[PDB]
Amino acid sequence: GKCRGLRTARKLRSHRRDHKWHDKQYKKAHLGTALKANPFGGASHAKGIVLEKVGVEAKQPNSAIRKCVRVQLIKNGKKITAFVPNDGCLNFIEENDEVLVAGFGRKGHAVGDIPGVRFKVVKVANVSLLALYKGKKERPR
Amino acid sequence: GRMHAPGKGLSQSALPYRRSVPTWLKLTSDDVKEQIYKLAKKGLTPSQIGVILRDSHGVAQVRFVTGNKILRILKSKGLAPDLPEDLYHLIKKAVAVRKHLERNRKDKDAKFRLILIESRIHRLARYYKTKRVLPPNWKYESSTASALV
Amino acid sequence: VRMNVLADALKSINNAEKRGKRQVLIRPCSKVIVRFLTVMMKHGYIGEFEIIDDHRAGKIVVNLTGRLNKCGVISPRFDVQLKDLEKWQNNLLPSRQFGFIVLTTSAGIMDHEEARRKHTGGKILGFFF
RNA sequence: GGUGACCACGGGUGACGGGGAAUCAGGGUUCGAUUCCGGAGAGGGAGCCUGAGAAACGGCUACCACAUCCAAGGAAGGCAGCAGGCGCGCAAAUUACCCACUCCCGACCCGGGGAGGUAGUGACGAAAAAUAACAAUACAGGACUCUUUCGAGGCCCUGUAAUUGGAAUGAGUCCACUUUAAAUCCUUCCGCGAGGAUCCAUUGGAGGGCAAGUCUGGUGCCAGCAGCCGCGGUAAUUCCAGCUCCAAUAGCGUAUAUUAAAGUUGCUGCAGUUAAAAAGCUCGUAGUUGGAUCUUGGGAGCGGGCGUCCCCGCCGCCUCUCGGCGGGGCCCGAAGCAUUUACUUUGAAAAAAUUAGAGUGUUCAAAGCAGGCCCGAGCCGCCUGGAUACCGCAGCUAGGAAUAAUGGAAUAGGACCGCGGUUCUAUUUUGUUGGUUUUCGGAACUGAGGCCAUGAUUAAGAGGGACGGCCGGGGGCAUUCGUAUUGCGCCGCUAGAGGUGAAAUUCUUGGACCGGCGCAAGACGGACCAGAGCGAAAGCAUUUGCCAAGAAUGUUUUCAUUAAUCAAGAACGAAAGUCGGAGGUUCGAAGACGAUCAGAUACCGUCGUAGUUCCGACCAUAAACGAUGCCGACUGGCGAUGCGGCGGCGUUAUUCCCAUGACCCGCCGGGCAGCUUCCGGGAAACCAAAGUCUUUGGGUUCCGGGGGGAGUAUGGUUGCAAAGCUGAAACUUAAAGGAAUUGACG
RNA sequence: AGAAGACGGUCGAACUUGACUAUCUAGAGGAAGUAAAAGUCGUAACAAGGUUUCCGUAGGUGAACCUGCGGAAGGAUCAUUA
Ligand SMILES: [Mg+2]
Ligand SMILES: [Mg+2]
Ligand SMILES: [Mg+2]
Ligand SMILES: [Mg+2]
Ligand SMILES: [Mg+2]
Ligand SMILES: [Mg+2]
Ligand SMILES: [Mg+2]
Ligand SMILES: [Mg+2]
Ligand SMILES: [Mg+2]
Ligand SMILES: [Mg+2]
Ligand SMILES: [Mg+2]
Ligand SMILES: [Mg+2]
Ligand SMILES: [Mg+2]
Ligand SMILES: [Mg+2]
Ligand SMILES: [Mg+2]
Ligand SMILES: [Mg+2]
Ligand SMILES: [Mg+2]
Ligand SMILES: [Mg+2]
Ligand SMILES: [Mg+2]
Ligand SMILES: [Mg+2]
Ligand SMILES: [Mg+2]
Ligand SMILES: [Mg+2]
Ligand SMILES: [Mg+2]
Ligand SMILES: [Mg+2]
Ligand SMILES: [Mg+2]
Ligand SMILES: [Mg+2]
């Protein structure tokens, strides 16, 4: 069982210390790796240049082509696929155009279908897809 | 459940309420201290005296008859041994295990019963160093052990 | 081995009263036992116990009644600083309406109510309720 | 020499340190570059002047690192003051006005202050709070009353509309005033300023989690949706649209860090038969943890409910050797000091802001700290505030002595003018100063006595240790036997036998196989043999000897807290495996053939190497398994058996009994085990224990946190090497899994 | 009084060459994993999975694999009828 004694404040502290390098959710957060690995250098979103448009094939049970963008981030020069959300919006984005890419909500998990795509596009040439696909702000020229 | 074995047994001695001497007895605190005296002289351990005195002789317990317990009667007169009887029984035992290990270098069993015995020695020793009956120096040594018996 | 002679005893007098046992003896005995059982005697939690005097340690024999749901023991005797006494008697007793944390202060062994009347803290032993 | 696993030393930080913050049943968890305090640096270092005061950067000296002008000789560079720009960037303000407030420096009421205040920018964020209300209609309804209902009176209602209708107001705009420094902003107000088609609320949703439509269009596994579950393949409650509704709503969305949620890091407070999981076993240093046992009952009173029963001040001791509030007391001043703490309670000290929270028509509130009043202002002025609690640990003070350690007398010592011998040395005193010697006071030392009921708590259903009679396939070392087995020797007879779902390679008239008698070598110890035995676990069986070792029981034997578990560190550890060596009984990886098969480099066959056999080193792992850590306590039955003991009631024998010994019947301790049950557990299977667990903590060791990647890579170490031990991540992944249910197929 | 200057010494940026450690990356070619998810060749496992299964070790093999030895039952027998 547990150690339970009265001058055992350390055997306890030091017990509950190491038996966190067996937690998963902290070994992301406190180790290093994460900051080192995620192209998003601990940063909520990030800007990057659209280097080409790529359709991705969804995971078996749901057949469809997902319509994403290969990005290269400015700060790193680290590359990316980002699924351009909402219908017919890939149609907006052209090559070499500067996009603000944010996460998906799973923080590292790829979302649902879109096998291995953490990132979603938000803005395009200082616009925001939400404004374009609603037809509020037009494409700049 | 014992120090060094699985056996969790109990078999021990057990005295009554009563302590006051049991009236058979003649002798008196002196004639017992006259007899412990002559047996230790002859060469017997503090346990072994307590023995002779009960089976053949008369005293349930020396402690009750006289004021104090056997060791103190020998010690306050200077018939007490060099080291504790309790300990050199282990040392004498160790040296006996040593011997046949030194002829029979296969006995894996003897190579606890040594290690254990060694450990039941050291363990004992290091209170006899805090209770200060041994000087804070004496130590086992394999070589010097055989002599010490 | 026998580390704590309460836990020893109190297990065996909770652990009879479950079976509905009429009375039980407690093998090791102590002063602290007596002094904490006599507390249980006042609030009714047991009846009259009659301590045998085997020459060595002591045995006790506790008249039980139905009334004791559980008694237990907090094993390390933490030091209770009177402000904490509440936070304890919240999370260690079934209600604010009965239940008794026996502890051991400056002015003897007693329940938590009696340490509060005298306004003393001290070391938690256990609890019956 | 000093420090160290009470973890130093080494490495790292997305580290300027505090005061606090948001979270929060109690406990934490992360953040605190953030205005308050404390530190540091002005690209980086070093050195410098000067200065009380600086190693000062709105100084300078180089260097390094940066960079400006040039007449090419030279010269001037430091925004981490304020503004501003560039670069970086997911990510952040105006070359604004001013000393009017608070304060500071000066020689100083007088200047200056990008300290500072004021504007501007400013969904960082917090407070308040419009986006309409109401009458009558038209109706749309529904509790009294009236009606069998249909209907109606109507006190009640409410829906939409007509807007029928005027009333009310602000958002704006703008006379005017205040404000302020001048504004601005706010507060004040003249004047204009609401019938929607306006003065116009949006963002997500509408299967579920989750509040809200199998309403209507379109697409048809596309587009697309969907944090997860999912929908989409020709009626989609799921896509794109339309209409309706819902939530919050002036906000509302997604990006991610983090907290609860997390009884998924578990101190409180997780888990370890099977679900992820207890070391193979044992020893053992640190650490943690450790039985009982020591002033009490009682007394004296005051006070609640002749006495009884609650409730209070008392009987910390010692000293007085110490003060004094010619001999004093009186007791405070000192100290034995609280043995030496741990613990508890009371003080004191704790910067403000923040926090908790007193007081207060800010119009409320966040706030603010004032305000209130007295007053018709004749008062030419009164009255009150600016509360308080917490503020860890450590430190300081004072009570208490519940528990935990810890201490004191035992090869003799406390005291008792108890007495002296030796020495020391201080100082009073001999009308003063010196000398000698004294008396005495205080140390130090030490002869010799008196008294001190003169000192050891007990032995643990803790341990340790002695002895006793057994016990046991425990271990070693010798020794002895048994068979079979193959080998050979010989002899007999004879042709097939071994192997097989069937056969052949194979063995054979060169007489195999079989029979007999002989030798041989090595193996292994059959039945007896069991929920039988022992050891730690690997573990352990022919006879006899010797050599140590061990449990258990037995014990008015001794010691007396000596103990449990244990990082660290050791002993042992099938088999397999490896170096040496010895040997080659069978079996037998590897290896050779025969078959079988679509094939079989497999199974089924026939050979047979390493090895299985020995002695000597290593290796250090098992499904090393009861998949159950070790010690310790408690809770039910009932059967059996191994050992020891005890008791009894038997008898076979065995003898005249005996002693025995063998059975029978009991009890007792500790062993291996069984069944049974609504203890109680337990997801379940099950479990006297996996029982004592939200009624949460007896002690302690190890160790798991979705699955894989992976027991991988890398690092370290051990090993001759197989390998052993230590042991990551990116990435991917939604379940993998466990227990039981029906299925259904073997 | 007293400048320029010069001998010495001390802190010492800086520069040059070694050492360490930290961190970060370039890389011909090689071997895993995962994706992942519908290719071929088998069919190792789950039913007596056609050969009870599994561990460790060894040796082998086109691949599951197979075979020794010692284990395991998590079995396909809680029993074998003195
Ligand atoms: Mg042990
Ligand atoms: Mg760094
Ligand atoms: Mg700079
Ligand atoms: Mg400075
Ligand atoms: Mg400087
Ligand atoms: Mg500057
Ligand atoms: Mg911002
Ligand atoms: Mg300013
Ligand atoms: Mg707001
Ligand atoms: Mg509006
Ligand atoms: Mg929903
Ligand atoms: Mg959390
Ligand atoms: Mg909680
Ligand atoms: Mg869990
Ligand atoms: Mg085990
Ligand atoms: Mg035999
Ligand atoms: Mg170890
Ligand atoms: Mg072996
Ligand atoms: Mg071998
Ligand atoms: Mg060999
Ligand atoms: Mg074969
Ligand atoms: Mg293992
Ligand atoms: Mg369990
Ligand atoms: Mg628990
Ligand atoms: Mg995991
Ligand atoms: Mg399994």
PDB file of all heavy atoms in Angstrom, chain E residues 3-4 17 31 34 39 48 51 77-78:
ATOM      1  P     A E   3      51.270  67.220 -13.907  1.00  0.00           P
ATOM      2  OP1   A E   3      50.125  66.751 -13.087  1.00  0.00           O
ATOM      3  OP2   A E   3      52.622  66.653 -13.665  1.00  0.00           O
ATOM      4  O5'   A E   3      50.895  67.019 -15.440  1.00  0.00           O
ATOM      5  C5'   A E   3      50.016  67.944 -16.113  1.00  0.00           C
ATOM      6  C4'   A E   3      50.484  68.192 -17.524  1.00  0.00           C
ATOM      7  O4'   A E   3      51.705  68.987 -17.531  1.00  0.00           O
ATOM      8  C3'   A E   3      50.887  66.970 -18.339  1.00  0.00           C
ATOM      9  O3'   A E   3      49.821  66.127 -18.758  1.00  0.00           O
ATOM     10  C2'   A E   3      51.646  67.638 -19.475  1.00  0.00           C
ATOM     11  O2'   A E   3      50.824  68.229 -20.462  1.00  0.00           O
ATOM     12  C1'   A E   3      52.461  68.674 -18.698  1.00  0.00           C
ATOM     13  N9    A E   3      53.757  68.128 -18.293  1.00  0.00           N
ATOM     14  C8    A E   3      54.095  67.519 -17.110  1.00  0.00           C
ATOM     15  N7    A E   3      55.336  67.094 -17.072  1.00  0.00           N
ATOM     16  C5    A E   3      55.836  67.413 -18.325  1.00  0.00           C
ATOM     17  C6    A E   3      57.098  67.223 -18.917  1.00  0.00           C
ATOM     18  N6    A E   3      58.129  66.645 -18.298  1.00  0.00           N
ATOM     19  N1    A E   3      57.272  67.670 -20.178  1.00  0.00           N
ATOM     20  C2    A E   3      56.241  68.261 -20.797  1.00  0.00           C
ATOM     21  N3    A E   3      55.012  68.503 -20.344  1.00  0.00           N
ATOM     22  C4    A E   3      54.871  68.041 -19.091  1.00  0.00           C
ATOM     23  P     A E   4      50.092  64.560 -18.987  1.00  0.00           P
ATOM     24  OP1   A E   4      48.849  63.948 -19.513  1.00  0.00           O
ATOM     25  OP2   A E   4      50.719  64.014 -17.753  1.00  0.00           O
ATOM     26  O5'   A E   4      51.124  64.550 -20.202  1.00  0.00           O
ATOM     27  C5'   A E   4      50.721  65.039 -21.498  1.00  0.00           C
ATOM     28  C4'   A E   4      51.904  65.161 -22.438  1.00  0.00           C
ATOM     29  O4'   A E   4      52.982  65.937 -21.842  1.00  0.00           O
ATOM     30  C3'   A E   4      52.600  63.862 -22.805  1.00  0.00           C
ATOM     31  O3'   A E   4      51.821  63.058 -23.671  1.00  0.00           O
ATOM     32  C2'   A E   4      53.927  64.366 -23.359  1.00  0.00           C
ATOM     33  O2'   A E   4      53.906  64.622 -24.745  1.00  0.00           O
ATOM     34  C1'   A E   4      54.228  65.523 -22.395  1.00  0.00           C
ATOM     35  N9    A E   4      55.072  65.007 -21.323  1.00  0.00           N
ATOM     36  C8    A E   4      54.717  64.608 -20.059  1.00  0.00           C
ATOM     37  N7    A E   4      55.703  64.070 -19.382  1.00  0.00           N
ATOM     38  C5    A E   4      56.769  64.095 -20.268  1.00  0.00           C
ATOM     39  C6    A E   4      58.102  63.656 -20.158  1.00  0.00           C
ATOM     40  N6    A E   4      58.610  63.098 -19.058  1.00  0.00           N
ATOM     41  N1    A E   4      58.908  63.816 -21.232  1.00  0.00           N
ATOM     42  C2    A E   4      58.396  64.377 -22.337  1.00  0.00           C
ATOM     43  N3    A E   4      57.157  64.816 -22.564  1.00  0.00           N
ATOM     44  C4    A E   4      56.387  64.647 -21.475  1.00  0.00           C
ATOM     45  P     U E  17      42.783  30.439 -34.526  1.00  0.00           P
ATOM     46  OP1   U E  17      43.029  29.882 -35.878  1.00  0.00           O
ATOM     47  OP2   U E  17      41.396  30.750 -34.106  1.00  0.00           O
ATOM     48  O5'   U E  17      43.408  29.445 -33.450  1.00  0.00           O
ATOM     49  C5'   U E  17      44.464  28.561 -33.838  1.00  0.00           C
ATOM     50  C4'   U E  17      45.041  27.853 -32.644  1.00  0.00           C
ATOM     51  O4'   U E  17      45.044  28.694 -31.451  1.00  0.00           O
ATOM     52  C3'   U E  17      44.279  26.647 -32.144  1.00  0.00           C
ATOM     53  O3'   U E  17      44.205  25.552 -33.057  1.00  0.00           O
ATOM     54  C2'   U E  17      45.008  26.418 -30.828  1.00  0.00           C
ATOM     55  O2'   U E  17      46.306  25.872 -30.961  1.00  0.00           O
ATOM     56  C1'   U E  17      45.064  27.857 -30.292  1.00  0.00           C
ATOM     57  N1    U E  17      43.906  28.170 -29.432  1.00  0.00           N
ATOM     58  C2    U E  17      43.797  27.472 -28.237  1.00  0.00           C
ATOM     59  O2    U E  17      44.611  26.638 -27.878  1.00  0.00           O
ATOM     60  N3    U E  17      42.679  27.766 -27.496  1.00  0.00           N
ATOM     61  C4    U E  17      41.682  28.667 -27.806  1.00  0.00           C
ATOM     62  O4    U E  17      40.736  28.816 -27.032  1.00  0.00           O
ATOM     63  C5    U E  17      41.862  29.346 -29.055  1.00  0.00           C
ATOM     64  C6    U E  17      42.940  29.082 -29.807  1.00  0.00           C
ATOM     65  P     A E  31      19.217  -3.048 -45.884  1.00  0.00           P
ATOM     66  OP1   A E  31      19.852  -4.350 -45.562  1.00  0.00           O
ATOM     67  OP2   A E  31      18.570  -2.861 -47.209  1.00  0.00           O
ATOM     68  O5'   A E  31      18.143  -2.768 -44.739  1.00  0.00           O
ATOM     69  C5'   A E  31      18.328  -3.261 -43.393  1.00  0.00           C
ATOM     70  C4'   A E  31      17.505  -2.457 -42.407  1.00  0.00           C
ATOM     71  O4'   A E  31      17.561  -1.050 -42.735  1.00  0.00           O
ATOM     72  C3'   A E  31      16.010  -2.752 -42.409  1.00  0.00           C
ATOM     73  O3'   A E  31      15.761  -3.909 -41.596  1.00  0.00           O
ATOM     74  C2'   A E  31      15.373  -1.439 -41.912  1.00  0.00           C
ATOM     75  O2'   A E  31      15.060  -1.414 -40.537  1.00  0.00           O
ATOM     76  C1'   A E  31      16.477  -0.401 -42.112  1.00  0.00           C
ATOM     77  N9    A E  31      16.113   0.776 -42.900  1.00  0.00           N
ATOM     78  C8    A E  31      16.262   0.973 -44.249  1.00  0.00           C
ATOM     79  N7    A E  31      15.899   2.166 -44.651  1.00  0.00           N
ATOM     80  C5    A E  31      15.485   2.798 -43.489  1.00  0.00           C
ATOM     81  C6    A E  31      14.981   4.089 -43.241  1.00  0.00           C
ATOM     82  N6    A E  31      14.796   5.006 -44.195  1.00  0.00           N
ATOM     83  N1    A E  31      14.669   4.407 -41.964  1.00  0.00           N
ATOM     84  C2    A E  31      14.853   3.481 -41.008  1.00  0.00           C
ATOM     85  N3    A E  31      15.316   2.237 -41.121  1.00  0.00           N
ATOM     86  C4    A E  31      15.619   1.956 -42.400  1.00  0.00           C
ATOM     87  P     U E  34       3.482  -1.303 -37.209  1.00  0.00           P
ATOM     88  OP1   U E  34       2.822  -2.152 -36.179  1.00  0.00           O
ATOM     89  OP2   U E  34       3.864  -1.897 -38.516  1.00  0.00           O
ATOM     90  O5'   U E  34       2.562  -0.043 -37.526  1.00  0.00           O
ATOM     91  C5'   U E  34       2.366   0.991 -36.545  1.00  0.00           C
ATOM     92  C4'   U E  34       2.173   2.331 -37.213  1.00  0.00           C
ATOM     93  O4'   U E  34       3.380   2.772 -37.900  1.00  0.00           O
ATOM     94  C3'   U E  34       1.146   2.393 -38.321  1.00  0.00           C
ATOM     95  O3'   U E  34      -0.176   2.139 -37.845  1.00  0.00           O
ATOM     96  C2'   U E  34       1.493   3.751 -38.918  1.00  0.00           C
ATOM     97  O2'   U E  34       1.032   4.870 -38.183  1.00  0.00           O
ATOM     98  C1'   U E  34       3.025   3.657 -38.960  1.00  0.00           C
ATOM     99  N1    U E  34       3.441   3.080 -40.250  1.00  0.00           N
ATOM    100  C2    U E  34       3.356   3.893 -41.370  1.00  0.00           C
ATOM    101  O2    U E  34       3.042   5.069 -41.313  1.00  0.00           O
ATOM    102  N3    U E  34       3.662   3.274 -42.556  1.00  0.00           N
ATOM    103  C4    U E  34       4.020   1.955 -42.740  1.00  0.00           C
ATOM    104  O4    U E  34       4.242   1.539 -43.872  1.00  0.00           O
ATOM    105  C5    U E  34       4.066   1.181 -41.540  1.00  0.00           C
ATOM    106  C6    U E  34       3.767   1.749 -40.369  1.00  0.00           C
ATOM    107  P     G E  39      -7.506  -7.442 -52.504  1.00  0.00           P
ATOM    108  OP1   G E  39      -8.865  -7.035 -52.944  1.00  0.00           O
ATOM    109  OP2   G E  39      -7.236  -8.886 -52.283  1.00  0.00           O
ATOM    110  O5'   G E  39      -6.398  -6.915 -53.523  1.00  0.00           O
ATOM    111  C5'   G E  39      -5.001  -7.229 -53.305  1.00  0.00           C
ATOM    112  C4'   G E  39      -4.182  -7.044 -54.567  1.00  0.00           C
ATOM    113  O4'   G E  39      -3.412  -5.816 -54.446  1.00  0.00           O
ATOM    114  C3'   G E  39      -3.178  -8.158 -54.877  1.00  0.00           C
ATOM    115  O3'   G E  39      -3.578  -8.969 -55.978  1.00  0.00           O
ATOM    116  C2'   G E  39      -1.924  -7.404 -55.304  1.00  0.00           C
ATOM    117  O2'   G E  39      -1.919  -7.105 -56.685  1.00  0.00           O
ATOM    118  C1'   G E  39      -2.029  -6.113 -54.489  1.00  0.00           C
ATOM    119  N9    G E  39      -1.510  -6.124 -53.117  1.00  0.00           N
ATOM    120  C8    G E  39      -1.943  -5.329 -52.082  1.00  0.00           C
ATOM    121  N7    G E  39      -1.284  -5.527 -50.973  1.00  0.00           N
ATOM    122  C5    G E  39      -0.351  -6.501 -51.296  1.00  0.00           C
ATOM    123  C6    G E  39       0.641  -7.124 -50.496  1.00  0.00           C
ATOM    124  O6    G E  39       0.909  -6.928 -49.301  1.00  0.00           O
ATOM    125  N1    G E  39       1.391  -8.032 -51.233  1.00  0.00           N
ATOM    126  C2    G E  39       1.185  -8.342 -52.550  1.00  0.00           C
ATOM    127  N2    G E  39       2.001  -9.270 -53.070  1.00  0.00           N
ATOM    128  N3    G E  39       0.264  -7.774 -53.307  1.00  0.00           N
ATOM    129  C4    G E  39      -0.466  -6.871 -52.620  1.00  0.00           C
ATOM    130  P     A E  48     -11.926 -26.469 -28.554  1.00  0.00           P
ATOM    131  OP1   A E  48     -13.038 -26.992 -27.724  1.00  0.00           O
ATOM    132  OP2   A E  48     -11.143 -25.314 -28.042  1.00  0.00           O
ATOM    133  O5'   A E  48     -10.937 -27.684 -28.849  1.00  0.00           O
ATOM    134  C5'   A E  48      -9.523 -27.466 -29.018  1.00  0.00           C
ATOM    135  C4'   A E  48      -8.900 -28.594 -29.796  1.00  0.00           C
ATOM    136  O4'   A E  48      -9.457 -29.844 -29.364  1.00  0.00           O
ATOM    137  C3'   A E  48      -9.102 -28.571 -31.306  1.00  0.00           C
ATOM    138  O3'   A E  48      -7.810 -28.874 -31.839  1.00  0.00           O
ATOM    139  C2'   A E  48     -10.194 -29.639 -31.541  1.00  0.00           C
ATOM    140  O2'   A E  48     -10.055 -30.215 -32.828  1.00  0.00           O
ATOM    141  C1'   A E  48      -9.822 -30.650 -30.469  1.00  0.00           C
ATOM    142  N9    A E  48     -10.634 -31.695 -29.869  1.00  0.00           N
ATOM    143  C8    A E  48     -11.547 -31.497 -28.865  1.00  0.00           C
ATOM    144  N7    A E  48     -11.841 -32.587 -28.199  1.00  0.00           N
ATOM    145  C5    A E  48     -10.988 -33.541 -28.735  1.00  0.00           C
ATOM    146  C6    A E  48     -10.811 -34.907 -28.467  1.00  0.00           C
ATOM    147  N6    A E  48     -11.534 -35.582 -27.570  1.00  0.00           N
ATOM    148  N1    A E  48      -9.872 -35.570 -29.178  1.00  0.00           N
ATOM    149  C2    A E  48      -9.162 -34.895 -30.092  1.00  0.00           C
ATOM    150  N3    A E  48      -9.241 -33.612 -30.434  1.00  0.00           N
ATOM    151  C4    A E  48     -10.188 -32.985 -29.714  1.00  0.00           C
ATOM    152  P     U E  51      -2.605 -31.538 -37.877  1.00  0.00           P
ATOM    153  OP1   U E  51      -2.211 -30.504 -38.882  1.00  0.00           O
ATOM    154  OP2   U E  51      -2.586 -32.973 -38.264  1.00  0.00           O
ATOM    155  O5'   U E  51      -1.703 -31.351 -36.569  1.00  0.00           O
ATOM    156  C5'   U E  51      -1.595 -32.301 -35.467  1.00  0.00           C
ATOM    157  C4'   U E  51      -1.502 -31.583 -34.125  1.00  0.00           C
ATOM    158  O4'   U E  51      -0.245 -30.900 -33.896  1.00  0.00           O
ATOM    159  C3'   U E  51      -2.429 -30.410 -33.936  1.00  0.00           C
ATOM    160  O3'   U E  51      -2.550 -30.190 -32.489  1.00  0.00           O
ATOM    161  C2'   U E  51      -1.731 -29.334 -34.826  1.00  0.00           C
ATOM    162  O2'   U E  51      -2.011 -27.986 -34.445  1.00  0.00           O
ATOM    163  C1'   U E  51      -0.258 -29.593 -34.500  1.00  0.00           C
ATOM    164  N1    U E  51       0.934 -29.659 -35.314  1.00  0.00           N
ATOM    165  C2    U E  51       2.042 -29.058 -34.750  1.00  0.00           C
ATOM    166  O2    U E  51       1.969 -28.118 -33.980  1.00  0.00           O
ATOM    167  N3    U E  51       3.240 -29.536 -35.197  1.00  0.00           N
ATOM    168  C4    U E  51       3.440 -30.589 -36.038  1.00  0.00           C
ATOM    169  O4    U E  51       4.581 -30.893 -36.354  1.00  0.00           O
ATOM    170  C5    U E  51       2.247 -31.249 -36.451  1.00  0.00           C
ATOM    171  C6    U E  51       1.073 -30.801 -36.044  1.00  0.00           C
ATOM    172  P     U E  77     -11.247 -29.698 -20.769  1.00  0.00           P
ATOM    173  OP1   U E  77     -12.562 -30.063 -21.353  1.00  0.00           O
ATOM    174  OP2   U E  77     -11.100 -28.449 -19.980  1.00  0.00           O
ATOM    175  O5'   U E  77     -10.789 -30.935 -19.885  1.00  0.00           O
ATOM    176  C5'   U E  77     -11.738 -31.591 -19.044  1.00  0.00           C
ATOM    177  C4'   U E  77     -11.080 -32.723 -18.298  1.00  0.00           C
ATOM    178  O4'   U E  77      -9.738 -32.942 -18.812  1.00  0.00           O
ATOM    179  C3'   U E  77     -10.863 -32.536 -16.802  1.00  0.00           C
ATOM    180  O3'   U E  77     -12.044 -32.603 -16.008  1.00  0.00           O
ATOM    181  C2'   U E  77      -9.803 -33.595 -16.533  1.00  0.00           C
ATOM    182  O2'   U E  77     -10.317 -34.897 -16.345  1.00  0.00           O
ATOM    183  C1'   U E  77      -8.903 -33.409 -17.764  1.00  0.00           C
ATOM    184  N1    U E  77      -7.935 -32.363 -17.426  1.00  0.00           N
ATOM    185  C2    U E  77      -6.788 -32.749 -16.757  1.00  0.00           C
ATOM    186  O2    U E  77      -6.483 -33.915 -16.580  1.00  0.00           O
ATOM    187  N3    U E  77      -5.983 -31.716 -16.356  1.00  0.00           N
ATOM    188  C4    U E  77      -6.217 -30.370 -16.522  1.00  0.00           C
ATOM    189  O4    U E  77      -5.388 -29.560 -16.121  1.00  0.00           O
ATOM    190  C5    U E  77      -7.450 -30.054 -17.163  1.00  0.00           C
ATOM    191  C6    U E  77      -8.250 -31.033 -17.575  1.00  0.00           C
ATOM    192  P     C E  78     -12.583 -31.281 -15.253  1.00  0.00           P
ATOM    193  OP1   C E  78     -13.876 -31.609 -14.613  1.00  0.00           O
ATOM    194  OP2   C E  78     -12.489 -30.131 -16.184  1.00  0.00           O
ATOM    195  O5'   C E  78     -11.545 -31.106 -14.056  1.00  0.00           O
ATOM    196  C5'   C E  78     -11.484 -32.020 -12.928  1.00  0.00           C
ATOM    197  C4'   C E  78     -10.375 -31.607 -11.979  1.00  0.00           C
ATOM    198  O4'   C E  78     -10.426 -30.173 -11.753  1.00  0.00           O
ATOM    199  C3'   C E  78     -10.407 -32.245 -10.597  1.00  0.00           C
ATOM    200  O3'   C E  78      -9.092 -32.535 -10.119  1.00  0.00           O
ATOM    201  C2'   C E  78     -11.102 -31.185  -9.750  1.00  0.00           C
ATOM    202  O2'   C E  78     -10.794 -31.151  -8.374  1.00  0.00           O
ATOM    203  C1'   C E  78     -10.568 -29.904 -10.375  1.00  0.00           C
ATOM    204  N1    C E  78     -11.466 -28.750 -10.205  1.00  0.00           N
ATOM    205  C2    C E  78     -12.707 -28.741 -10.850  1.00  0.00           C
ATOM    206  O2    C E  78     -13.014 -29.701 -11.568  1.00  0.00           O
ATOM    207  N3    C E  78     -13.527 -27.676 -10.698  1.00  0.00           N
ATOM    208  C4    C E  78     -13.151 -26.651  -9.933  1.00  0.00           C
ATOM    209  N4    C E  78     -13.996 -25.627  -9.800  1.00  0.00           N
ATOM    210  C5    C E  78     -11.898 -26.638  -9.255  1.00  0.00           C
ATOM    211  C6    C E  78     -11.095 -27.699  -9.417  1.00  0.00           C
TER     212        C E  78
END
